[PDB]
Design a protein. Structure first.
Ligand SMILES: [Ca+2]
Length: 251
């Protein structure tokens, strides 16, 4: 599957040591919603070595129970939220990763339309200003906080000729998500968006011109804590890592 998409157009193999490459990755740190992130999530995102670093051939994003204040808003956890500086329309995205094992964590590999104009993102109003969900969202990988034996694929959008919020997706079983690398992938073209875990299709959504999946998207990588899909965080939580061996994007 996906063999049609054979021209490498963006990648990071994480074979340097230090901060994520600033030519490739933008950090989000400003909260979008009056001091907070969406979905009742409990973290701040920062650009510090506490929450992200590259070593030993892999990127780590690390969530920590840590009191942290940004512009008068205090939260009890810190993490990182990266966006690719690369925006692209159609392609095959492959991310090979190990997911956090701890309860309360909500890792994601996902895209937003580049016209999202989300506060503090890399693209601003360059492509437009289509407030979510009108910019479109593809969730290549999520896990919730309470079931680490399943992965999520999902889509969120509004049709171009409607304000009605649509969302749907699937899930699939996963073994040893935290201790074994798996490859989370998207194959996206004008016909369809297909999300896979290794070779297993998790969900395929037919595309059409009435969707927001025919204009540029960028990639996001993060760990949220708590909130809708993180759920309850044990009192004893200290920290956890989402470890990414590489991101590759083909067209
Ligand atoms: Ca690597």
């Amino acid at each position: 599957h996906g063999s049609a998409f054979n021209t490498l157009v963006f990648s990071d193999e994480f074979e340097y040591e230090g901060k994520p490459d600033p030519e490739k990755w933008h950090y989000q740190v400003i909260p979008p919603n009056n001091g907070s992130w969406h979905n009742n999530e409990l973290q701040h995102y920062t650009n510090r070595s506490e929450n992200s670093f590259v070593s030993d051939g892999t990127l780590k994003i690390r969530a920590i129970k840590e009191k942290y204040t940004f512009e008068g808003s205090t939260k009890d956890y810190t993490s990182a939220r990266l966006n690719s500086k690369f925006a692209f329309t159609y392609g095959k995205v492959e991310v090979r990763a190990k997911l956090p094992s701890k309860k309360g964590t909500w890792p994601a590999i996902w895209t937003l339309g580049a016209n999202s104009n989300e506060t503090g993102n890399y693209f601003g109003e360059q492509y437009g200003n289509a407030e979510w969900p009108a910019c479109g969202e593809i969730d290549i990988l999520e896990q919730n906080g309470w079931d680490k034996e399943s992965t999520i694929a999902h889509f969120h959008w509004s049709d171009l000729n409607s304000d009605e919020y649509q969302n749907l997706g699937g899930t699939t079983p996963i073994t040893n998500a935290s201790g074994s690398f798996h490859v989370y992938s998207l194959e996206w073209n004008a016909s369809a968006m297909k999300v896979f875990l290794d070779d297993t299709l998790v969900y395929e959504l037919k595309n059409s011109q009435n969707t927001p999946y025919n204009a540029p998207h960028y990639l996001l990588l993060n760990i949220a804590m708590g909130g809708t899909l993180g759920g309850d965080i044990p009192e004893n939580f200290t920290d956890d890592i989402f470890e990414i061996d590489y991101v590759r994007i083909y067209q």
